From Swiss-Prot, chain B:
Gene3D superfamilies: Spore Coat Polysaccharide Biosynthesis Protein SpsA, Chain A. Keywords: Carbohydrate metabolism, Nucleotidyltransferase, Signal, Transferase. Transmembrane segments: none annotated. This is UTP--glucose-1-phosphate uridylyltransferase YngB. Its EC number is 2.7.7.9.
Amino acid sequence: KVRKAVIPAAGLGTRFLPATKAQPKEMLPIVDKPAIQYIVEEAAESGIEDILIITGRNKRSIEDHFDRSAELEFNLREKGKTETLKEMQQIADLANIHYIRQKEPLGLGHAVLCAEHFIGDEPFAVLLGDDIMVSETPALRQLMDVYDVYGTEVVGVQSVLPEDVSKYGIINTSGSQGHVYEVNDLVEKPSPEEAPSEIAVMGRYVLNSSIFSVLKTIGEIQLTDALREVCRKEPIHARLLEGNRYDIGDKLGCFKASTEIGLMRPEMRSQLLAYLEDVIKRETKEMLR
Amino acid sequence: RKKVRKAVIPAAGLGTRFLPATKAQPKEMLPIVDKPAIQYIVEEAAESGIEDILIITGRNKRSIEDHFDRSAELEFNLREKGKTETLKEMQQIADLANIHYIRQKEPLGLGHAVLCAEHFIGDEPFAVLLGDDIMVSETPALRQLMDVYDVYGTEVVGVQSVLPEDVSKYGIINTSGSQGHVYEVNDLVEKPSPEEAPSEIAVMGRYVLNSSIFSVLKTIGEIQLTDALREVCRKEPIHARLLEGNRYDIGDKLGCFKASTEIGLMRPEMRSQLLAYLEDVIKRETKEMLR
């Protein structure tokens, strides 16, 4: 049973300045939720009970977000917002959130190694926080279900258009079966010709304790290479992810994500669409002059 | 006789309208395009020629103070990466104005908050800027209030008209008349019922005030700031500027989305990608709908 998960969150989030000048990338609101909350929500509903966040300096707000906020709870009760005061309490209840500091930044490989003693001897989940997934079955849960079966290192995938492939990590299927591709090798951001498929891994993984040894020997320790050297000995699995994927690596990415998820809320759906119609009308008019 | 050189931004709000985003971080740091709302306000003030700002802050609002200082660990990462355009943009933020802080001890609204500023401005005219809208203007909104001050030298208020329904959301002027761009306030009521309201002209959290206002505010006292404009009106009548620019209220989650969109569309770097995306959303929503 996979019951533990690792979110690396040590990035200084430069792509988002000046929003992130003095506050973390992962706290940026997506609709009105911090990005990080979406990821912990994924994990909780996937049945993870314990999360380790590899954090850095001045990311106190993440730790605060998932605890009881006394001065807020008071202020909410003392104003009636009872539904809200309950929503806030639930956030602090999603999972047991552990923290470790990445000492200096040596990438998602060092980061995964930090988890070593915490997970110890289980299979664990890693969730980079690079995209938000809307699904009938939570994205990670789907990776776990392929794990429950094959019990090897499973990867989460979706297809992407050629001439996009240098942005992502790439499987190399010889076989494809059910909802589960079968991995023979792996490449980190290949040139469109170098690339042996149009399938990218979407910052979701389930891994084995084993992977720790593996990750240590290999060593700027890229995590993919350790999936590669596991593939030479033995072949892994990949799940095609049911659901909608919103990349949030960009300022624009985020705007899009805010909009699409916004459109899922009945209270904002119509207000939003109406507003977008009127922006376009206004932009056409101004343009024909 | 005196130039307005100082401004007061109250920022002690717990920002409930924005939960859960604001559970563990301040309302005023929420990004509008990619700038914290608070930065828009300091930018207004800076370009209006304000040199010194006092923020009345509260608990766990360190991020505001940090935002406007040098960020050593970031400067390193930027320098050691080439991004010198950025490292220069960040340095400018920390240069907009001289930013002072005071903690509001207990939460007793603007008014009390304005009183905190007393000793800091001492004996000048000062600006207050609540942070409830962004104004896009040829002339920065506050500058326009200051220009009416330069002449009439009374307590000037910043105004724009609003549709009848929304008058209970605002403070409403009560003119006798109007001359060029400057109304002539006779009284003021704080968010009245739509019939009780004696105009459709609302104050847009911009004020220029006199030291005098301190005394005034003390006697009155839950210290509403409007009532102190009222008791100034009993002795003598105030002035109001109609504001030139385009106004984006950010009091609401929706308000902010709209503000992000409009200001986004004004930035050449993002304008086309954005607009294309918006066209695309509607096209896709029509298709899905016809089936």
